[PDB]
Ligand binder design. Structure first.
Ligand SMILES: [Ca+2]
Ligand SMILES: [Ca+2]
Ligand SMILES: [Ca+2]
Ligand SMILES: [Ca+2]
Length: 150
């Protein structure tokens, strides 16, 4: 759930609803997201259209619009918190988390993890195989990990 921001979501809906019909188009959806500071991803969009409207109407209600905007503003906060955590591990700021980086912070927070258990963490996140974890890869394991923690 969003808080005071749904008043801003309402303002963006009414403005790009030319008719005042209480419904917007697929073409009107993407500009209203752009107005609220969100660049709609093309791959992300096709799943969104199907999720808010199954029938061949092409209409999007305010409640549909509040639903997509809530997850987008939630994703933005989730991403920013993940990247805040990413900078904690990559303290030498090379752009990648090494085994030495992960071990150092594990000892600093007093985590009861051995060298083998820490290295397994690197290898599962390491999708490309260079032995270190970059920004793209760290975002992948973190959304997986969010499933376990709430
Ligand atoms: Ca309309
Ligand atoms: Ca609908
Ligand atoms: Ca590093
Ligand atoms: Ca890597």
């Amino acid at each position: 759930l969003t808080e005071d921001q749904k008043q801003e979501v309402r303002e963006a809906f009414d403005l790009f609803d030319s008719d005042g019909s209480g419904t917007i188009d697929v073409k009107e959806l993407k500009v209203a997201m752009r107005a609220l500071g969100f660049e709609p991803r093309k791959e992300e969009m096709k799943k969104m259209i199907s999720e808010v409207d199954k029938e061949a109407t092409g209409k999007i209600s305010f409640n549909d619009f509040l639903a997509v905007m809530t997850q987008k503003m939630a994703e933005k906060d989730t991403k920013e918190e993940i990247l805040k955590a990413f900078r904690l591990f990559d303290d030498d700021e090379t752009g990648k988390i090494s085994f030495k980086n992960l071990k150092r912070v594990a000892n600093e927070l007093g985590e009861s993890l051995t060298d083998e258990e820490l290295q397994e963490m690197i290898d599962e996140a390491d999708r490309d195989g260079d032995g270190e974890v970059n920004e793209e890869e760290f975002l992948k394991i973190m959304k997986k990990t969010n499933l376990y923690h709430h």
